[PDB]
A paper describes a structure:
Toluene is a key signal effector required to activate the TodS/TodT signal transduction system. We determined the structure of PAS1 in complex with the agonist toluene. The overall structure of the complex is generally identical to that of apo-PAS1. The agonist is positioned in a hydrophobic pocket formed by the hydrophobic residues Phe46, Gly48, Val59, Ala63, Phe79, Trp84, Trp85, Ile114, Val126, Phe128, Ala145, and Gly147 in each PAS1 molecule. In detail, the benzene ring of toluene is placed into the area formed mainly by the aromatic amino acids Phe46, Phe79, Trp84, Trp85, and Phe128. The methyl group of toluene is surrounded by the residues Gly48, Val59, Ala63, and Ala145. The PAS1 protein was titrated with toluene, and the ITC data were integrated and fitted into a “one set of binding sites” model, which yielded a stoichiometry of 1:1 and a binding affinity (Kd, dissociation constant) of 8.5 μm for each molecule in the PAS1 dimer. In the PAS1 structure with toluene, the corresponding region is dramatically reconstructed into an α-helix. By contrast, in molecule B, tilting of the Phe46 aromatic ring occurred only in response to the agonist toluene, and this was linked to the formation of a salt bridge between Arg148 and Glu146 and the transformation of the flexible STR region (in apo-PAS1) to an α4 helix. Upon toluene sensing at an effective level, the PAS1 STRs are reconstructed to induce functional reorganization of TodS and transmit signals to TodS/TodT, ultimately up-regulating the tod operon.
Numbering used by the authors:
A (entry chain B): 43 to 167
B (entry chain A): 42 to 165
Write the structure that this text describes.
Amino acid sequence: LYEFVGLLDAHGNVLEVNQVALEGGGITMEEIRGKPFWKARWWQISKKTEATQKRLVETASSGEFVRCDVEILGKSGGREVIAVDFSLLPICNEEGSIVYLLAEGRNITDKKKAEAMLALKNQEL
Amino acid sequence: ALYEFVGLLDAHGNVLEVNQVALEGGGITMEEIRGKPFWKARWWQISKKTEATQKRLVETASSGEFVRCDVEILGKSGGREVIAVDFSLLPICNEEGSIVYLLAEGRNITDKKKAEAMLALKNQ
């Protein structure tokens, strides 16, 4: 189940975003509505992270189901980085034309947590 | 055309997100409807018949069939007033093809129908 969710048009302009994602980034609808999703502050760690989001939007708009782990300015009202399992789902109309994209973010398990999980299981056996 | 009201439903039609324009128009809070079937929400509650219609439309989209039709809803003045809406449901599939969400959209056509009524009188 997602944590962050957003609705984009086919070109990646922002239409709707849930409050959890806005509060996490310290971002308002007024700042991002109708402007490309990749320009919003969550994606602004670097020119590289913004370029990755732009490519994830463009490829989704071409009908790919894309997903990858990303770091975003998405905790403590945008002051801190979190890692997110990000996806875009193309949404087609009744003719098969992509008209929207559904952006979803889920939490990622800390590396040290996963290591602790396996250490504990090996130890419990 | 771009929607005025929009909602995201799960594969079974339970409400996940709705825009503020639809909530304010219907006089509905996100807590009253989240995680519960879309046809139970107040927009669809003019009668048992309207609710049954929305239930069947949701179930149709849940099978992958796209829906568009005109409907009336309790959607203006905090749920006090009925408006006519051009309504659609888009099934959203994952890459495997399974339906994972439904997108509900609507545009108020109350003033379009009144303008068509006036044109019909003028033409006479």
